[PDB]
Design an enzyme around this catalytic site. Structure first.
Site, PDB file in Angstrom:
ATOM      1  N   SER A 146      47.172  42.908  36.442  1.00  0.00           N
ATOM      2  CA  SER A 146      46.572  42.956  37.736  1.00  0.00           C
ATOM      3  C   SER A 146      47.244  43.917  38.718  1.00  0.00           C
ATOM      4  O   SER A 146      46.647  44.180  39.754  1.00  0.00           O
ATOM      5  CB  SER A 146      46.531  41.569  38.403  1.00  0.00           C
ATOM      6  N   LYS A 186      45.034  46.664  40.086  1.00  0.00           N
ATOM      7  CA  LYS A 186      44.330  46.654  41.342  1.00  0.00           C
ATOM      8  C   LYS A 186      45.008  47.442  42.443  1.00  0.00           C
ATOM      9  O   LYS A 186      44.348  47.742  43.475  1.00  0.00           O
ATOM     10  CB  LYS A 186      44.067  45.216  41.792  1.00  0.00           C
ATOM     11  N   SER A 200      43.570  39.544  44.480  1.00  0.00           N
ATOM     12  CA  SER A 200      43.279  40.234  43.246  1.00  0.00           C
ATOM     13  C   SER A 200      41.966  39.819  42.600  1.00  0.00           C
ATOM     14  O   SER A 200      41.872  39.826  41.385  1.00  0.00           O
ATOM     15  CB  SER A 200      44.494  39.976  42.319  1.00  0.00           C
ATOM     16  N   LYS A 214      52.015  43.893  45.244  1.00  0.00           N
ATOM     17  CA  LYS A 214      51.241  43.214  44.292  1.00  0.00           C
ATOM     18  C   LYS A 214      52.171  42.476  43.301  1.00  0.00           C
ATOM     19  O   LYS A 214      53.066  42.994  42.669  1.00  0.00           O
ATOM     20  CB  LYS A 214      50.325  44.107  43.426  1.00  0.00           C
TER      21      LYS A 214
END
EC number: 3.4.16.4
Length: 337
Positions: free
Chosen positions: A42, A45, A91, A194
């Protein structure tokens, strides 16, 4: 002379890869397997949000525009502000597909933009396949490349980057939290990035923190335990601020030196730099930072163009030149006679 010139030991980090860099200088403060290709999961992203920030910067769409969901249920209309908050804090995989089609016409064209931005950034170990990264397969990145993406986010798209410190946002009367637990840590001033976890990607985190004017970026990938999710990165940030400082000895357009010019419309050249000087040195050693410059010819003769290079500035610490920069003419000097 042992405590002044001491090189600190890097803490023990329980993860497979890590890197810690200074946002302004670009200096690498600590690194372990930073170029090893891994699944970012992820963290993918981040690039997705980068491409969206660039589109909003260029005026293609705005936060108040409405997006129709297609093939979050189909056909509802959702503002861009909500969809990108969903991507950035949460996310959400739905919101990535809805935004890819809105922005690029299709997922594949969006992926095509992700990967040309990879080449524009100079990343040598990243490649994407989807807008969201769900596919545990085949797509890869590295701790170094992910920290450099982090930096580009902060640098190129500041209006996109400011969304990552929001603690909460409301999807449809439904309150949603940012997943980056470090935002609530009172010991640091974290304002980013993130977080992501896959059983094969391990625990991954691209964090950024500031202290004074100083900004650091860490990237830890393949973290092995739940309890070191946040703690390992917090170690690394804290360490970097404890032992290092970033100073800014010279800004663009400031006169650094002045030298006689022969044959032009004035007898003095105002000398400097065409890009800002940021340096990362061991905390507390600034007052020892010495700067000097050498010219490439004895006499500066006219004409001189604005930003022409006429020498070098040498930044020194302990008799060691830690950085060199081109010394430039800050103001054009036409030949007089």
């Amino acid at each position: 002379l042992n405590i002044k010139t001491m090189i600190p030991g890097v803490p023990q980090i329980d993860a497979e890869s890590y890197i810690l860099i200074d946002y302004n200088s670009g200096k690498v403060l600590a690194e372990q397997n930073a170029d090893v290709r891994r699944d970012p999961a992820s963290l993918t992203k981040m690039m997705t949000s980068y491409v969206i920030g660039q589109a909003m910067k260029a005026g293609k769409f705005k936060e108040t525009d409405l997006v129709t969901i297609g093939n979050l249920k189909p056909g509802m209309q959702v503002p861009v502000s909500q969809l990108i908050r969903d991507i950035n804090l949460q996310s959400g995989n739905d919101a990535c597909v809805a935004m890819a089609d809105f922005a690029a016409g299709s997922q594949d064209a969006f992926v095509g933009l992700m990967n040309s931005y990879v080449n524009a950034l100079g990343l040598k170990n990243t490649h994407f396949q989807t807008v969201h990264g769900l596919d545990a397969d085949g797509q890869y990145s590295s701790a170094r490349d992910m920290a450099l993406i982090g930096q580009a986010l902060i640098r190129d798209v500041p209006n996109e980057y400011s969304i990552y410190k929001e603690k909460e946002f409301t999807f449809n009367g439904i309150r949603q939290l940012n997943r980056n637990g470090l935002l609530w840590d009172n010991s640091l001033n974290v304002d980013g990035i993130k977080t992501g976890h896959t059983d094969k990607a391990g625990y991954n985190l691209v964090a950024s923190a500031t202290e004074g004017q100083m900004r650091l970026i860490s990237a830890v990938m393949g973290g092995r335990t739940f309890k070191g999710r946040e703690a390992e990165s917090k170690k690394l940030l804290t360490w970097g601020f404890r032992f290092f400082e970033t100073v800014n000895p010279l800004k663009v357009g400031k006169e650094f030196a002045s030298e006689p010019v022969w044959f032009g419309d004035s007898d003095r050249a105002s000398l400097g730099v065409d890009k800002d000087v940021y340096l990362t040195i061991p905390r507390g050693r600034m007052k020892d930072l010495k700067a000097s410059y050498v010219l490439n010819s004895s006499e500066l003769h006219a004409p001189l163009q604005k930003n022409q290079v006429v020498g070098t500035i040498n930044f020194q610490l302990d008799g060691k030149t830690i950085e060199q920069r081109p010394l430039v003419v800050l103001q054009e000097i036409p030949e007089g006679n």
